[PDB]
Amino acid sequence: RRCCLGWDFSTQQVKVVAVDAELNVFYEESVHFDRDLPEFGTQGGVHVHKDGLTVTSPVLMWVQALDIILEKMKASGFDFSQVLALSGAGQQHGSIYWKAGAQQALTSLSPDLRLHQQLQDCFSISDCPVWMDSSTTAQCRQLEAAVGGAQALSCLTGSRAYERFTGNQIAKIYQQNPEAYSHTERISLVSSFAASLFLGSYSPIDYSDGSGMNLLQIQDKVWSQACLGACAPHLEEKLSPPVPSCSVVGAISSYYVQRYGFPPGCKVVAFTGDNPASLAGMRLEEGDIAVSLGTSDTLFLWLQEPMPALEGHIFCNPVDSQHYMALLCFKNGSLMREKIRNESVSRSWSDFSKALQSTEMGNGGNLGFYFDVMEITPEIIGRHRFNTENHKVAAFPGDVEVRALIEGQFMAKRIHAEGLGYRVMSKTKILATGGASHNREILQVLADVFDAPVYVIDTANSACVGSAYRAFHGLAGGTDVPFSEVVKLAPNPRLAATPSPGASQVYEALLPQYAKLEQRILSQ
Numbered sequence: 001r002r003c004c005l006g007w008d009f010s011t012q013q014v015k016v017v018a019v020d021a022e023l024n025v026f027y028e029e030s031v032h033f034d035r036d037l038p039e040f041g042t043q044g045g046v047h048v049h050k051d052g053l054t055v056t057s058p059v060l061m062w063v064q065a066l067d068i069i070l071e072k073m074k075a076s077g078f079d080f081s082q083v084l085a086l087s088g089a090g091q092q093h094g095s096i097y098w099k100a101g102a103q104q105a106l107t108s109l110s111p112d113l114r115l116h117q118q119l120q121d122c123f124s125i126s127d128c129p130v131w132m133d134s135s136t137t138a139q140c141r142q143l144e145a146a147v148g149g150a151q152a153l154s155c156l157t158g159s160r161a162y163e164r165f166t167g168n169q170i171a172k173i174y175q176q177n178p179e180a181y182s183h184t185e186r187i188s189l190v191s192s193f194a195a196s197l198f199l200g201s202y203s204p205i206d207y208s209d210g211s212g213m214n215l216l217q218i219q220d221k222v223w224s225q226a227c228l229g230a231c232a233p234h235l236e237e238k239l240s241p242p243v244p245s246c247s248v249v250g251a252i253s254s255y256y257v258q259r260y261g262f263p264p265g266c267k268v269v270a271f272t273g274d275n276p277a278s279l280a281g282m283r284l285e286e287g288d289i290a291v292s293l294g295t296s297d298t299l300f301l302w303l304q305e306p307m308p309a310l311e312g313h314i315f316c317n318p319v320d321s322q323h324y325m326a327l328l329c330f331k332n333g334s335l336m337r338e339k340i341r342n343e344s345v346s347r348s349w350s351d352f353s354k355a356l357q358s359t360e361m362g363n364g365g366n367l368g369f370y371f372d373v374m375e376i377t378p379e380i381i382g383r384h385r386f387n388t389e390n391h392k393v394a395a396f397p398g399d400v401e402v403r404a405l406i407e408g409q410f411m412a413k414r415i416h417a418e419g420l421g422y423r424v425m426s427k428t429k430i431l432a433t434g435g436a437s438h439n440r441e442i443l444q445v446l447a448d449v450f451d452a453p454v455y456v457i458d459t460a461n462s463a464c465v466g467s468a469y470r471a472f473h474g475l476a477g478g479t480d481v482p483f484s485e486v487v488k489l490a491p492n493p494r495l496a497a498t499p500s501p502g503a504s505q506v507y508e509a510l511l512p513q514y515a516k517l518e519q520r521i522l523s524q
């Protein structure tokens with residue numbers, strides 16, 4: 001049983017899966033930060049600072065967690081001699097600042113000691129900013145002004161300036177702690193930091209996670225000189241050139257060979273971000289989209305031809321370096337669905353389903369926008385309801401309300417995805433995951449709106465699994481072969497719904513009416 005390992009250096013834990021060559025997951029293990037390393041005093045794996053905006057994690061907690069998990073695997077009897085290759089994912093945006101002289105410690109690791117003990121003094125910043133940090137608003141505004149505005153930055157990097165994006169965090173560290181910045185020889189993302197631990201030398205950053213920094217020119221796949229210069233000095237030499245995601249960055253360090261019994265030929269495939277790795281785990285191809293339903297709803301799009309905007313995030317594609325992917329986040333998700341269920345259908349998901357069954361596609365032309373909290377895609381708040389003559393109304397009947405919510409939420413996902421360059425194709429598959437993916441009637445509206453089949457998939461280990469798939473892709477030929485042909489044998493998702501007859505005719509007319517009403521609300 002030969003295998004690849006798929007790692008996930010996440011906010012709350014370090015996780016690993018072992019996938020065999022038939023692409024079956026046969027082993028999983030994890031180390032949970034608060035529970036297993038309580039000495040760091042984290043909550044949710046992070047430290048929220050007094051200001052309520054600065055959010056960090058101690059770098060050495062992530063190092064120590066890797067030591068614990070490898071020893072936990074050993075103690076369970078995991079056969080490391082069977083590992084042909086490995087890759088992994090990192091929580092996006094988060095950064096590691098390596099102190100001058102740290103690569104000498106990485107390259108001289110002794111198998112008799114743990115990583116934590118040997119890399120103890122290798123970091124110029126002990127508390128790493130993570131994806132939850134929102135303390136860099138001034139750096140965001142300065143970065144945008146320096147390059148010609150929010151739209152100019154997005155065209156260049158796939159996103160306007162976001163507080164959590166790495167370049168804004170590097171700028172804040174350079175401004176507030178210039179001494180630590182001057183003593184930093186290398187800056188890694190969580191993904192490339194974790195790859196560096198397995199190599200025993202610095203890994204480059206990949207194109208895909210490299211796209212979550214407001215630094216990489218996504219088109220030319222080179223660092224933007226204007227973005228680098230607007231954040232901190234000598235930054236390019238600290239980052240090193242970025243590489244295609246399907247790159248063998250080196251063999252595993254002899255440290256792991258001697259300490260754990262990994263074979264010396266075990267290959268380390270470039271790590272990537274957790275969202276890009278989940279896209280690989282979900283096996284999205286051209287024309288596909290995944291809908292992650294939850295407290296926030298997240299759209300994962302494949303993009304051949306990107307159109308960066310003031311909303312969403314375009315990244316270089318992890319499984320096809322010539323194309324792209326995008327994330328679109330919706331703040332009004334499951335709480336909004338639960339509130340409408342409670343108000344209109346007697347707190348019953350069954351009556352919620354029956355309201356969708358008992359109403360026609362297009363809802364008689366009744367359209368609704370439901371934003372009890374300020375929405376981000378787009379920036380609107382309030383509930384806004386319109387009847388078949390496009391007149392604003394105060395309320396709908398209960399059943400109409402349920403369909404207006406579900407049908408509007410899915411039409412918005414389609415409209416905002418097309419704003420970034422996405423187009424439904426004859427090959428299109430829609431993948432759905434999360435709480436609301438357990439409701440057939442909700443998934444039917446989704447199938448009708450996009451005029452494409454919907455499949456349900458469990459994604460709890462999507463980043464791990466996607467990483468093991470990418471490791472297998474590197475062994476099966478890398479850039480010489482399509483990722484999709486390597487993973488064709490992986491488990492297929494179950495088909496949940498297919499568009500009803502006439503759905504295309506209904507939504508071809510209704511989608512432009514919904515988009516016009518959205519623009520009407522934004523302007524007024």
Ligand SMILES: O=C(CO)[C@@H](O)[C@H](O)CF
Nearest residue numbers: 011091092131164274275
């Ligand atoms: O900030 C995010 C995406 O831009 C998150 O999904 C982090 O990757 C979670 F770790």
